[PDB]
Point group: D2
Chain length 255, copies 4
């Protein structure tokens, strides 16, 4: 582990499930003081939780003031809350398309905007944004999702450049990870039959050079590294946690 994360105040958005939850759980294991900002209840959890809608600037600011005055500081902000729906730019309603941008992008902008003034009062604060391997190689009929993930990269670089050297800001670009959302994605394609869903997830896993999809904990490992002093000279980049997906051309060669 990273001993410097102990006792540090860490905020994770959208951590009541999946990747966000594995991230919150890793920081708890690192001895940090973790606060989950999300609309859903994480139920039984080793970390604190605050009902908060990341797209509601008034709720976000208030939740961040509560954390700072209650804890005394904020060292790490992990922007993770996000969503996805499918459809061509032609069929998906404009409302649904803007909503995806609002959650996946504006939610990061709001949390970052209000947390930064408090974070820079701490020693070496760090922000980690969860993007996607789709900030590079993309999927079909995911216009809004793909756009928001590219936008997150731009926000990450600009925050990194605007606040260096006091604060660092990096992104994590995961490929297919074993989460409920990915489970839903499979289902929306092969039905509710959980065994077919397993064959589907397996097909995706085999497209990754590592021959399997990733685990939430593996994304959390990258987040913990980037948030620690071990990444002291690392800022403005995306650490790809994709089992080699982004460097693989789907073209066979003689074996």
């Amino acid at each position: 582990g990273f001993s410097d994360l102990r006792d540090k105040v860490v905020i994770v958005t959208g951590a009541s499930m999946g990747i966000g939850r594995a991230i919150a759980e890793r920081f708890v294991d690192e001895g940090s003081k973790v606060i989950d900002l999300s609309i859903h209840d994480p139920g039984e959890a080793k970390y604190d939780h605050i009902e908060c809608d990341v797209t509601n600037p008034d709720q976000v600011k208030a939740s961040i003031d509560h954390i700072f005055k209650e804890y005394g500081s904020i060292s790490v902000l992990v922007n993770n809350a996000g969503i996805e729906s499918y459809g061509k730019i032609e069929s998906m309603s404009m409302g649904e398309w803007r909503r995806i941008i609002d959650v996946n992008l504006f939610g990061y902008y709001y949390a970052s905007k209000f947390a930064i003034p408090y974070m820079i009062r701490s020693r070496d604060p760090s922000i980690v944004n969860i993007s996607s391997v789709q900030a590079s190689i993309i999927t079909k009929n995911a216009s809004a999702y793909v756009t928001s993930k590219h936008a997150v990269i731009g926000l990450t670089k600009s925050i990194a450049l605007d606040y260096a050297p006091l604060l660092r800001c990096n992104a994590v670009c995961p490929a297919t990870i074993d989460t409920p959302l990915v489970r839903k994605a499979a289902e929306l394609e092969v039905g509710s039959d959980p065994m077919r869903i397993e064959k589907k997830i397996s097909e995706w896993g085999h497209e990754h050079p590592m021959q399997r999809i990733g685990k939430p904990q593996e994304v959390a490992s990258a987040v913990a590294f980037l948030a620690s002093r071990e990444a002291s000279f690392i800022t403005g980049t995306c650490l790809y946690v994709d089992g080699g997906l982004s460097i693989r051309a789907p073209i066979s060669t003689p074996e």
Copy 2:
């Protein structure tokens, strides 16, 4: 020139000045039937113009519907309309930040969403999105702008993947170009002295390996190429027109 562009219907957003105007004029010179969609009147111009605010999806749709009925088709759409304001995430109001995203990203989404259905009714239609070199290397205190330009790359890949092989979609990533916006950016730093401004612009020029800033017609050449059949197997990419800016590290070496 690119002969296949003659007589084809080409829509260019924000073509009343700068890069947009240079793009419209190049297509006119190619013999294309050009329509400018912007809020400002380009005065005496060889291309057609329709008053249109790209952040208004209803006006965008109406404008595009009208063009199709009046001209019979739409083969090329060039999304160029954009704006830039400066400020740290903490100082720029949320409204202004959001307004930059509205024009720079949603404007491209709206124009694309409504033109595509018509475009796929023509032979090998093409869309070219003007992004920026800042889709890779960025400037300070330009959070909203930088974010919007990264987002445009995502939208570009999505459209390219969603509609290939029927329609192609690419972007152009310009570095510093001689336009009113850029002259204004310099003025915001050095004042109205045409001598002190030329100095600031010459400074930026010397930062580019080509030792000068680009000309609008140079960006227009890249747009015409990508919109033409000379780029029939090119889709989903960004053609950098940056005089080498994006590949230069600002670290001296012996000489």
Copy 3:
């Protein structure tokens, strides 16, 4: 076409077949004075040919002096000559691995090294290096090939930076193109049966968003553009001619 290429002296290496030949043929159509530098005879061709081994620095220099003194100048150098063989870093002999680097990299370095002193005496000389989409997304068991293609990108950037603004240097990154080499690649996998080879090539084509492999002429179009004045502010980049291959993740989504 690009009227500025007329009467210009253009050198193309490895142009007795495939991509290199389509490139030579395009410049001839542009009215340029084309000279093919290759070890094989292009037979009946509308352009000049000089028996030359690109890996032989003495042969390269001599061939370039012959061209310059005979023609009076050199405006464009297209480095294309290359090769490929398959095998894990473990099985392929070291001799075969170095040979691939020698042809795909050192051959570009030699031709560039000797042509540059003559080119910079011309107005706006241009160099175009043929790399590959594998300078980004790669194939398996192609260690030496993939490495050489990444190296070509580095050589391109450095030549661009070292000689700007007098001379420009760019690369073209093609994906699967209909060439004899690609035909051989298929065969080495599915046998000599030309019909199975067709089903194989078709499978590759369908992996590209454009749903087909590229044509040599389409690569030549990109080369002609980059070599012309239309690309006057373009230097140090790679123009991807990949039908969208490099931006596509091999992950299905709900349709």
Copy 4:
């Protein structure tokens, strides 16, 4: 620290000084059994050393064979040995240019080629190649160096794709780091005045958003992370340790 590294056999090339020495010392601190393969003796060090010229494949193979017989396995290989000389493609002799490629690229190919067969006999082996920020943004008159660093990225992807999921392979892309090589690079520009040298180094430091150059231990932190199980789903990528250098455009904006 990364507990899984304790007791594992780690080979580091060019670990007698600078980044290489910092990497060896970090692994020693992790409890690993470290062996340095270089031509220079690291003097009194906690890690083991074997006299070895990485451009000699026979000596590399012999050294690696010996390590495996003496230690029982090899879990990590860190390719770091490298050199840098400056000069325009026209002035640097072909021999020196080629020598840079021999050490910087072939040295990595040789060490990897001979260690891999042994490495796949251990549990989750890992290779980390030290590339450079110049695999993206480059410096002038560093043709061979820049070319070699791009090539290293290609070799890295290939190894990653060829041996996944058994073995992982990633690279680290360091910007300016405080090492003897860098101090020497500065001296080549400003002389031996420790005051004038510190000035040159401070100049380079201010070019990085972090406002300082990196420390060798910071590069070592990234290497240890990638070599550990904390990066089990990370392969084929380059982790940039550049203090933000690669995402900064050298163009001023109002403030």
